[PDB]
Curated annotation (Swiss-Prot), chains B, C:
Functional note: Confers DNA tethering and processivity to DNA polymerases and other proteins. Acts as a clamp, forming a ring around DNA (a reaction catalyzed by the clamp-loading complex) which diffuses in an ATP-independent manner freely and bidirectionally along dsDNA. Initially characterized for its ability to contact the catalytic subunit of DNA polymerase III (Pol III), a complex, multichain enzyme responsible for most of the replicative synthesis in bacteria; Pol III exhibits 3'-5' exonuclease proofreading activity.
Locations listed in the record: Cytoplasm
BP GO terms, sorted: DNA strand elongation involved in DNA replication
Principal localisation: cytoplasm
Protein name: Beta sliding clamp
Swiss-Prot record, chain D:
Gene: dinB
Species for this entry: Escherichia coli (strain K12)
First and last residues shown, out of full length: 243 to 351 of 351
Family note: Belongs to the DNA polymerase type-Y family.
Result, substituting A70S: In strain: ECOR 57B2, ECOR 59B2, ECOR 60B2 and ECOR 62B2
Domain of life of the source: Bacteria
Record note on quaternary structure: Monomer. Interacts with beta sliding clamp, which confers increased processivity.
Induction annotation: By SOS response. A member of the dinB-yafNOP operon. Induced by hydroxyurea.
Protein name: DNA polymerase IV
Compartments, record wording: Cytoplasm
Known function: Poorly processive, error-prone DNA polymerase involved in translesion repair and untargeted mutagenesis. Copies undamaged DNA at stalled replication forks, which arise in vivo from mismatched or misaligned primer ends. These misaligned primers can be extended by Pol IV. Exhibits no 3'-5' exonuclease (proofreading) activity. Overexpression of Pol IV results in increased frameshift mutagenesis. It is required for stationary-phase adaptive mutation, which provides the bacterium with flexibility in dealing with environmental stress, enhancing long-term survival and evolutionary fitness.
């Protein structure tokens, strides 16, 4: 599987959703630029967000989404933020996608 | 040769002996049925030289002995086209067989009986009877895994193996294998033969809900199945069938159980966006979950997530979805168990609650 | 564009609109449905550029307006493959349409709504409403006689003609003609149009269970049929269609009457021994009797003799037996009347009890 | 298309045996005539004709796939017994009708 992602480790931990949305706003065009390098139509299999907390625990996941799309990334972040942060500071925010997989064309044989 | 038989005593028999005939015959006579009146019996036989179906009909009405061959579909369509209950009078008249009923008359071309190919006779080595539904289960359980036109001719057919009191069928086409075994309630000699895939299909044509048991005779080079007044014979394939044991996964340490229907439907929807040619889907197993994904050259994708029982290590494996569906459609039970090893090794799939059948499917590379 | 609809509200509309989508498409968008959310309605449109079918589905659940096109069969197969009762959430997300229900997710490829063919505005000139089942009897009575790919493009379809209170269909392919008319209980203008055969076949896909009225609107260059929430529109065909009145035999003095089913079964058995390509059978009409004979290249022959009612001059005439059986199968009544002139003139066949439909079949040469 | 042979009688015959003896002599003649045009002797129909002393006649034919004396005799016998009505028979005829040529020409309506 092929992933493309970008992340920012903040100078200082953040504690407020507005800060996180603001970092997402600066990362998005960087992810777009990176992904456009390799997939100019921005078509992907999945995308999602990574938050790494001040204890170095993190949460990520991706969900199906066909392009790579800031609105959806922000929505995902806000839910992960609410919900997983658990009052901790956030040290790093990451956005990523996973590309659609290459086609499977090789069927193995039982070797009779 | 003459007989008179009422329509309905002919129709099923004609349907049955027309089984081996399919499509466009290679010699004319192979498109014909052999009819022979002997004693109080009309015999009808249809063949493709690899196998034959013979049906016997009692003749209660006046008859004269003799034999001839006539075009099977025309003779069938004539009898089927006549009114229900018609008495169909048949007599051979030189070349040409006359068929008359009411005010309808037909004359059909013949080819001489002495000229019809006989699957000449031989000596059963194994004889046994079982319910038709049991044979049908054995065959239905595995027939889809037979190869069609592999150069390895002994794969294009189905192995029938008697062990102990069990009859077992095995089929494989190199990508998957199916095995089913069932108790026949009779001690049987250890023996195994390969029935050509068209003989297996025909034998299935033959089997019907049925009051009547199936008697099976296995010769050196032939199998015979008798059900009521029908006798099917096929040549066997003379080759060595691969040993199915060596292709079973050696040490499946991962065991997944799932509901059979929910699994099948999840695969069936993922299959919609699988590659039309290669049919690849990816399965990701993790704690009590299976995720199936498919994506195609058109850059569409599907994902299905299912709860399953699984506590093994996480793994991903790819499969041709139509092979997996085939197995699931064959199992048609409540829960399935899949035993895996790793992404490049075959999986074994069975009914979680039955050991009658088992299936081994080789994966696709991820 | 966003909507969520329960699976069973989407299935029939999806089958109906994927409907004009015959075979493989020539332009990719033609294998797509256009989906449009506007107000509280989802519309789905399938087109092959000559005709289009549009279904409207009320949206009771939250939605957002917009439009796109998606591959019709895959969208249907996903919806169908979801469990009964599933809530299907659809949303357009750039060049992909996401469909989600349960933990099933799919992303289908789209092509822009703005690129979908919109059959342009026209005004209706003529309109009438009648039971679906009446339209279906009219079309079924004649449809088999439409030409397929005659260079006379106006024959490759069906005439729909109104006058007084009658609606009539006429179809002909130069070998035979069928004409059927029914009263539909309203004053109509005198008008007629030719609907292309594939439109007629599609109109027939649309008509089924014959509760809802069918409203038909006819324009200068288009026909539109509305049944429930479905709206079928087709172009019409130019050109001057044949007048069936001039095709009917002028004075087919010889009149024979027979049981429709007896006649049909006799022609069908004779057909078995007719020439496979040419399908010739010969009819011999004499006092209260019809003899049908067929014989083929293989020097097989059939003969049927029937009692009919007939008291006119003896004659012999040949027919393609398929043409005759098509008529007898479309008639499905108790007795037929054939009206003959001579061996080289067409025959007219009708229900002996009804003048609603009439068929004219040109003979083969003896 | 028909092939036939017939014997006109000197003196009218009134006994079936005399009919059958005539048939016995006609049959080879018919076989020969038919063989010249149809060596496999395959036909559509065959039958017999009797002409009677009152100048009426009857011909009785049915489907039968080859020229065949036994069937002609059986037909003759039936015709003799059912139709002769005590009249003298002045001619006996046997004949076949050949299977018709294939029909290949479909006419059109002339639209």
């Amino acid at each position: 599987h092929h992933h493309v992602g970008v992340e920012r480790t903040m100078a200082e931990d953040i504690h407020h959703w507005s800060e996180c949305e603001a970092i997402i706003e600066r990362l998005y065009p960087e992810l777009e630029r990176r992904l456009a390098k390799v997939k100019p139509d921005l078509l992907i299999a999945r995308q999602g967000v990574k938050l790494k907390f001040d204890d170095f625990q993190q949460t990520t996941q991706e969900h199906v989404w066909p392009r790579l799309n800031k609105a959806d990334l922000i929505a995902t972040a806000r839910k992960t933020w609410d919900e997983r942060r658990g009052g901790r500071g956030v040290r790093l925010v990451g956005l990523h996608v996973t590309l659609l997989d290459p086609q499977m064309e090789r069927q193995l044989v039982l070797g009779l | 040769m003459k007989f008179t038989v009422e329509r309905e005593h002919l129709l099923k028999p004609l349907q049955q002996v027309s089984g081996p005939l399919g499509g466009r015959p290679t010699l004319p006579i192979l498109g014909n049925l052999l009819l022979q009146v002997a004693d109080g019996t009309l015999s009808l036989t249809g063949t493709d030289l690899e196998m034959e179906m013979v049906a016997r009909v009692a003749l209660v009405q006046p008859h004269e002995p003799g034999a001839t061959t006539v075009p099977a579909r025309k003779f069938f369509d004539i009898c089927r086209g006549l009114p229900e209950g018609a008495e169909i009078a048949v007599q051979l008249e030189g070349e040409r067989m006359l068929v008359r009923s009411g005010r309808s008359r037909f004359s059909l071309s013949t080819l001489p009986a002495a000229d019809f190919p006989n699957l000449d006779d031989w000596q059963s080595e194994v004889e046994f009877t079982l319910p038709q539904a049991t044979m049908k289960r054995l065959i239905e359980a595995t027939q889809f895994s037979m190869a069609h036109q592999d150069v390895r001719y002994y794969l294009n057919g189905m192995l029938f193996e008697t062990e102990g009191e069990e009859l077992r069928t095995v089929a494989t086409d190199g990508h998957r294998l199916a095995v089913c075994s069932m108790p026949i309630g009779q001690s049987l000699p250890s023996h195994s033969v390969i029935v050509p895939r068209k003989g297996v299909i025909e034998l299935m044509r033959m089997l019907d809900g049925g009051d009547n048991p199936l008697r099976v005779q296995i010769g050196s080079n032939n199998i015979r199945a008798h059900v009521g007044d029908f006798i099917f014979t096929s040549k066997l394939v003379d080759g060595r069938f691969p040993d199915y044991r060596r292709v079973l996964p050696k040490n499946p340490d991962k065991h997944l159980e799932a509901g059979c229907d929910l699994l099948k439907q999840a695969f069936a929807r993922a299959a919609i966006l699988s590659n039309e040619k290669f049919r690849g889907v990816r399965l990701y197993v993790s704690e009590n979950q299976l995720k199936i994904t498919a994506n195609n050259p058109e850059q569409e994708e599907a994902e299905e997530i299912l709860d399953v029982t699984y506590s093994g290590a996480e793994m991903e494996i790819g499969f041709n979805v139509s092979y997996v569906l085939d197995v699931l459609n064959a199992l048609k039970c409540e829960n399935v168990r899949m035993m895996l090893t790793d992404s490049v090794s075959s999986v074994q799939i069975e009914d979680a609650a039955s050991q009658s059948a088992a299936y081994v499917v080789m994966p696709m590379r991820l």
